Amino acid sequence: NHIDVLINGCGIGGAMLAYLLGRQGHRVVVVEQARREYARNRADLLKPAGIRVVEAAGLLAEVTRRGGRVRHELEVYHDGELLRYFNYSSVDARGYFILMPGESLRRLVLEKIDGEATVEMLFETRIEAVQRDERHAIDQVRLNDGRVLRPRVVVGADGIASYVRRRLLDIDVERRPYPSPMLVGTFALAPCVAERNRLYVDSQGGLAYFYPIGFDRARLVVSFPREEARELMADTRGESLRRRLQRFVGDESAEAIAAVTGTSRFKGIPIGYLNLDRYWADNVAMLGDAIHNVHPITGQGMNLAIEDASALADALDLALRDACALEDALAGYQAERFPVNQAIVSYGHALATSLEDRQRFAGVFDT
Ligand SMILES: Cc1cc2nc3c(=O)[nH]c(=O)nc-3n(C[C@H](O)[C@H](O)[C@H](O)COP(=O)(O)OP(=O)(O)OC[C@H]3O[C@@H](n4cnc5c(N)ncnc54)[C@H](O)[C@@H]3O)c2cc1C
């Protein structure tokens, strides 16, 4: 019952870590509270560095074979006029980004994990108790199915409300909510949306981001002040919302507005603002939403989870092969990832807090 790594959470971050460790021959058990099939809303965006991880995992061809989309442009509008146009490929060819539903990528990764004999995935399972040795390393973990494991390393890949973080490391985080919630819905795909990603914001705090997802659908991400968001999402046949959009979303996206046939399918997007001071303690490390929360206006939750996963895999690989002490490996992991995650956490908060003020908002983008 000795294992190398116990991963708490089989979300995109934990799955990626499991596969990368598995590919190297390490003995991994992944504990996931939900069913494997269980499919929810999630982030959709892979940035260049996340794409490089997927390429290194041998998955990049399959991503677009499974309905992932390469893109290289964004338009940003404020009060119905074009504020910025970005071409991410103008100077660098690999500047492109990918839109891929997080759950489709996760499914792809789990398919690959099935093939890795040294990884065992336990769905509808949880950690029940842990014991620490005299050096305060976790040396034994009891699951809720009675299974006892003896892992060298424990990883929290268990998301924004992380059990590992809160219950195994006793870290609490103070969370002050933003005044505008975010919601996401999935609609039919209009030609304007297939053509180009378009983000719209206005002086009264509206936001509407339209982008294609999968083969034949479109995502619409919206934000409004809390009270107004409730009012709009109550005319469930969507006339109120459509009218609201028409105030700040121009004719280029008329068919994308018309695709918003009702509001019942909208789901709230969790919002945090966090970059933890410590990514690890003892033989416990964390990744993704367990250590940082970026405002979802950035779309980068999945991206940074995958980036973390790759860096942690490299660190744990070195430690498990005896090339460096676990404590040095984990320090190196944090040193690499903390400033990258920090930059995006600061950027998201900047965008979300500035979007009513046109040149201020413009100012955040330029950087
Ligand atoms: C409902 C929803 C909608 C979202 N929509 C968007 C969006 O439109 N745009 C966007 O940019 N971002 C969105 N996000 C955020 C984005 O999905 C995350 O930032 C990203 O998936 C974080 O990756 P992760 O791997 O760190 O954690 P998660 O994806 O949170 O994965 C954590 C995993 O750990 C499991 N888990 C949690 N606690 C335990 C436990 N005690 N024991 C065992 N397993 C556990 C979970 O069931 C889950 O599978 C959304 C998130 C949610 C929940």
Author numbering: 4 to 370
Reproduce, without paraphrasing, sentences from the article in which this PDB structure was first reported:
In this study, we show that the catalytic activity of the flavoprotein monooxygenase (FPMO) PqsL can be triggered by blue-light illumination. The enzyme is involved in the biosynthesis of 2-alkyl-4-hydroxyquinoline N-oxides (AQNO) in the opportunistic pathogen Pseudomonas aeruginosa.
Our starting point was the observation that PqsL displays a deviation in its FAD-binding site where Gly45 replaces an arginine side chain mostly conserved in pHBH-related enzymes. Specifically, the equivalent Arg44 of pHBH anchors the pyrophosphate group of the FAD. Moreover, the flavin of the mutant protein is slightly shifted outward with respect to the wild-type conformation. We also found that neither cosubstrate specificity, substrate affinity nor KM values profoundly differ between PqsL and PqsL-Q, even though amino acid exchanges in PqsL-Q included positions designated to NADPH binding. The photoactivated reductive half reaction was assayed by NAD(P)H oxidation kinetics and revealed approximately 67% of wild-type activity. On the other hand, we can conclude that the more rigid conformation in which FAD is coordinated by PqsL-Q apparently does not hinder the photocatalytic reaction. Using an engineered variant of PqsL, we further demonstrate that stabilization of the protein-cofactor complex does not diminish photoreactivity, indicating that primarily the conformation of the flavin ring and its microenvironment are relevant for photoreduction.
